[PDB]
Write a protein that binds this ligand. Sequence first.
Ligand code: WYX
Ligand code: MG
Ligand code: MG
Ligand code: NA
Length: 269
Amino acid sequence: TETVGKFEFSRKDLIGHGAFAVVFKGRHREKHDLEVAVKCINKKNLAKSQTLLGKEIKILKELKHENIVALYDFQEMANSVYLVMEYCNGGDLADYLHAMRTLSEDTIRLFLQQIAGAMRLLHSKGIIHRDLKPQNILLSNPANPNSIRVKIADFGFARYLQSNMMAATLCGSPMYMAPEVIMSQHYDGKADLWSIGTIVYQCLTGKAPFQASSPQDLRLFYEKNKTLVPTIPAATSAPLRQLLLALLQRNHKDRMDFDEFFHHPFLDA
Ligand SMILES: CN1C(=O)c2ccccc2N(C)c2nc(Nc3cnn(C4CCNCC4)c3)ncc21
Ligand SMILES: [Mg+2]
Ligand SMILES: [Mg+2]
Ligand code: NA
């Protein structure tokens, strides 16, 4: 049993691992019924892990929203870092999609309304996420789709981007990266809208809109297709087709912007 502030956890209760973080289920030391998740360094990548957890604290201490994973407390020292975070009892969207195969349009709408709410706050604060993918969309059941609450997670790659500036750091997951990102170009907040389009498309169809054998293959594909149109099933509703066509636009200047996204007809219906 380890303690971090008024919280505790055991390393027996592993609920996630990646190259740059390990997450354990834990609880409040006084109110044992209050569940939390404690994110820790992965010692196999100590320096980068330490950097990314520190960045996540910096960003999440400024973001409070029902559709963003909460940061209850944290502890940073010279040689260790811990985050005490919201425990999402439904796991991730990736596992949910694997089980369901595809989601209904109505479920996609409910989830995307929530993602949109979170994105409105990121956008108003001038923050870009840069690692949106189903593994980083968590679910919480307060077990039918109307009651599922979605939370964007894993803000270790997120940054402030001033509205007249562009980012250029290569980060994210290649299958969810906007063309401009994977092509090593400058990008802005609209890169995350491409990622969201990709997630929506994957929920609808069970596949990636642009399949490739490797990251390199995907990049070459984007490079050689200056006009790029996703294959959308004919049976798709007209508003969802319109949303996907506008999000999955190769050239960022032309892509759907945040105001259009937040007010898109698909999200009313
Ligand atoms: C804070 N945090 C994270 O930063 C995060 C971010 C990205 C990806 C994973 C994370 N990890 C593991 C997180 N995972 C959970 N919840 C979670 C995981 N797996 N499960 C399953 C399902 C039910 N049955 C068994 C347990 C429940 N909440 C918060 C998490
Ligand atoms: Mg991130
Ligand atoms: Mg961009
Ligand atoms: Na993609």
